Ligand binder design. Structure first.
Ligand SMILES: COc1ccc(N(C(=O)Oc2c(C)cccc2C)c2ccnc(Nc3cc(OC)c(OCCCN4CCN(C)CC4)c(OC)c3)n2)c(OC)c1
Length: 273
């Protein structure tokens, strides 16, 4: 189990926090931009009581206590006496999917998009090496800093893997366009499932946040994939990159490359441009 709150180094008195601006509001709670001890800017997630189990809520906080890296949004603190809060490192420019649509994002050069792509792969390489999987890898869950660097966020579905794979529930449902076939079909996820999602994420980067598989419904996406087709070349997408995306979408999970490999290639692509 976890150390008791009176011993957990992560526990902080609720008095230390002040919620300032609401970033998101959902069925299970809200997320706010706030301040820790006045001067430190942070993000605070609050649990809407009754919406879900506190155990269920704090589970991702506990995983984040275990998974730490410069490229992953860092757990800052936790308040475990109701109401419950999960506090994290703050990212000024929000989600990558949103940032890419702003005046600043629209002007990003392909070189910078490749840089960011490599930054993301760098973080996944760490997750990969530590025997974890994300399962929710998408531009929506990549946050951007004030210095235009990227970090992986939302470890809600993230899981420590005991021996290569994790099996989800038969009732658990996932985003069709972002999830690997084997995961949608048998609920089985592996780091290779994340590699597939990364491919999809790449299309999000080069299209400045467009929804993958343009003009296609989910039934259509699934049917086309089974025929051997893959997403159509996005407008204005370097061919080298399109081909890297294809590696991420190979039929056999084992045939897809590692995240470290993806990182190296993207870094070469970046240094070139
Ligand atoms: C669902 O919203 C989300 C809200 C917050 C977070 N989140 C986080 O880590 O949440 C979290 C915590 C704290 C603990 C456990 C698990 C999770 C997910 C988080 C953590 C650190 N920085 C930021 N900055 C941010 C600044 C910003 O702005 C400064 C912004 O934009 C908000 C406004 C965007 N909207 C876009 C559409 N329209 C223009 C209205 C504004 C952002 O939006 C993405 C984000 N967000 C999400 O991370 C996935 C999604």
């Amino acid at each position: 189990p976890q150390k008791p709150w009176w011993e957990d180094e992560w526990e902080v008195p609720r008095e230390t926090l002040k919620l300032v601006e609401r970033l998101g509001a959902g069925q299970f709670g809200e997320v706010w931009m706030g301040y820790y001890n006045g001067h430190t800017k942070v993000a605070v997630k609050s649990l809407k009581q009754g919406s879900m189990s506190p155990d269920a809520f704090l589970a991702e906080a506990n995983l984040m206590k275990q998974l730490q890296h410069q490229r992953l949004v860092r757990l800052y603190a936790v308040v475990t006496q109701e109401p419950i809060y999960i506090i994290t490192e703050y990212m000024e420019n929000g989600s990558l999917v949103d940032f890419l649509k702003t005046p600043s994002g629209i002007k990003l050069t392909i070189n910078k998009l490749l840089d960011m792509a490599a930054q993301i792969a760098e973080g996944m390489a760490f997750i990969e090496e530590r025997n974890y999987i994300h399962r929710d890898l998408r531009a929506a869950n990549i946050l951007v800093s004030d210095t235009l660097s990227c970090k992986i966020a939302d470890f809600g579905l993230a899981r420590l893997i005991e021996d290569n794979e994790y099996t989800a529930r038969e009732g658990a449902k996932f985003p069709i366009k972002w999830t690997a076939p084997e995961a949608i079909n048998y609920g089985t996820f592996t780091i290779k499932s994340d590699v597939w999602s990364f491919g999809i994420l790449l299309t999000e980067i080069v299209t400045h946040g467009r929804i993958p598989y343009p003009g296609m419904t989910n039934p259509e996406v699934i049917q086309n994939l089974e025929r051997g087709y893959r997403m159509v070349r996005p407008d204005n997408c370097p061919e080298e990159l399109y081909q890297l995306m294809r590696l991420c979408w190979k039929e056999r999970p084992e045939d897809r490359p590692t995240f470290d490999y993806l990182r190296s290639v993207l870094e070469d692509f970046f240094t070139a441009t």
